[PDB]
């Protein structure tokens, strides 16, 4: 399990630690989309932070079931529900909470359990692509993981009205990789 920088948006040097955690607050109304991202271990974005992601880079192909775990780090007094839904490859990000509610989803009550782990049934970087003039064995299997505020963030006087969450990912034991491919932006300088 490595920390998945889902919140890969701030770049300002001193806010880089912020990429590790995204937040939830009272201000967010029921149904609102909290966050979203794809199940693309090797491609740019969130997965680059995970160790899995970095290792996928030294390989050309791969496939297996993944597994993301969410950790609520808010005050102990807070409670509420988050809907976490997975839209297989092809299925477009669900319009709203209710439509996402019909897909493979999980209601998460961080009032009961501080952690929850989602399994991504399958992802396969096998479909070849020869775009520009540089051939890249790409995904297309961009499975999607959406997260909606099933209920709002509830808290008693005395507790902060914001809390963060941490994404941790890894692959199941059925994971595999093929074709050693050394590639890197970081190299030994002269």
């Amino acid at each position: 399990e490595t920390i998945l920088e889902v919140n890969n948006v701030p770049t300002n040097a001193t806010s880089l630690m912020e990429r590790l955690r995204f937040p939830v607050s009272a201000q967010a109304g029921k149904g609102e989309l909290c966050a979203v991202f794809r199940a693309d271990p090797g491609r740019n974005g969130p997965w680059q932070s995970t160790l899995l992601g970095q290792l996928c880079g030294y390989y050309t192909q791969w496939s297996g079931s993944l597994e993301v775990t969410f950790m609520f780090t808010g005050s102990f007094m807070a409670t509420g529900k988050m809907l976490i839904a997975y839209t297989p490859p092809g299925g477009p990000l669900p319009k709203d909470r209710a439509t996402a509610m019909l897909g493979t989803h999980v209601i998460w009550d961080f009032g009961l359990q501080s952690s929850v782990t989602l399994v991504i049934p399958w992802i396969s970087n096998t479909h070849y692509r020869a775009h520009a003039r540089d051939g890249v064995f790409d995904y297309y299997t961009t499975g999607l993981v959406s997260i909606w505020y099933q209920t709002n963030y509830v808290v008693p006087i005395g507790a902060p009205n914001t809390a963060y969450i941490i994404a941790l990912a890894a692959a199941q034991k059925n994971f595999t990789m093929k074709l050693c491919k050394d590639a890197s932006d970081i190299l030994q300088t002269g």
Partner: antibody, heavy 121, light 106 residues
């Protein structure tokens, strides 16, 4: 207290360029998105730009997208708005506003006291 | 390209009676917010998400509306409220309303 106090402006001839700035006080500036709004001689209110909590995204309306550019420097807690190729329709009183998050939408909590821009020959 | 029309533009209450200002939209809208502007001073925050009141606002102010017609209601009216009240929409192009000059009757 939360204070938004802005600076710049005056008379400018049409075609000239100008830069407006707003200074923040008494709230963590980086954690908020910040917008400018203009008021024509005490009647009409028109949104002109927003900036994300960090660098991130900028957003503009279709009356201004092209000439104005909104910026922030999160070391001195200060917004910036440079306006180039200023026109006669740009005369107004410009406020800097803080944008908070609600259940779904956004809302402007505090407004500064504004600077006045008169574009005229 | 989403316009908000406010009626009426000018109003006069006794005071001690109620006041109903209206913000109508050209298309269906999710929520509406309200500001206040007294003379010489900038706009102040008043109502958000249609029915929630900003910390300062007296409890005598109210908010409702659904779809395309929303309204700010005041009961009862007091000489300290006289200002211009603007509505605002947050769905697409962030538009303001024309305002409503609320005034004291004598």
């Amino acid at each position: 207290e939360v204070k938004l106090v802005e600076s710049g402006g005056g008379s400018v001839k049409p075609g000239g360029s100008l830069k407006l700035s707003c200074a923040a006080s008494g709230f963590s500036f980086s954690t908020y998105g910040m917008s400018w709004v203009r008021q024509t001689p005490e009647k009409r209110l028109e949104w002109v730009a927003t900036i994300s909590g960090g660098g991130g995204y900028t957003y503009y309306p279709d009356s201004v997208k092209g000439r104005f550019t909104i910026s922030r420097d999160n070391a001195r807690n200060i917004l910036y708005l440079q306006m180039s190729s200023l026109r006669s329709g740009d005369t107004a009183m410009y406020y800097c506003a803080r944008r908070v998050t609600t259940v779904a939408e956004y809302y402007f909590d505090y407004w500064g006291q504004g600077t006045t821009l008169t574009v005229s020959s | 390209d989403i316009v908000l029309t406010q009626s009426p533009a000018i109003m006069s209450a006794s005071p001690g009676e109620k006041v109903t200002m209206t913000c109508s939209a050209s298309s269906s809208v999710s929520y509406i917010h309200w500001y206040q502007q007294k003379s010489g001073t900038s706009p102040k925050r008043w109502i958000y998400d249609t029915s929630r009141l900003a910390f300062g606002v007296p409890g005598r102010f109210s908010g409702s509306g659904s779809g395309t017609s929303y309204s700010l209601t005041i009961s009862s009216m007091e000489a300290e409220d006289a200002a211009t009240y603007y509505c605002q929409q947050w769905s697409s192009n962030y538009t303001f309303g024309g305002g409503t000059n609320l005034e004291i009757k004598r």
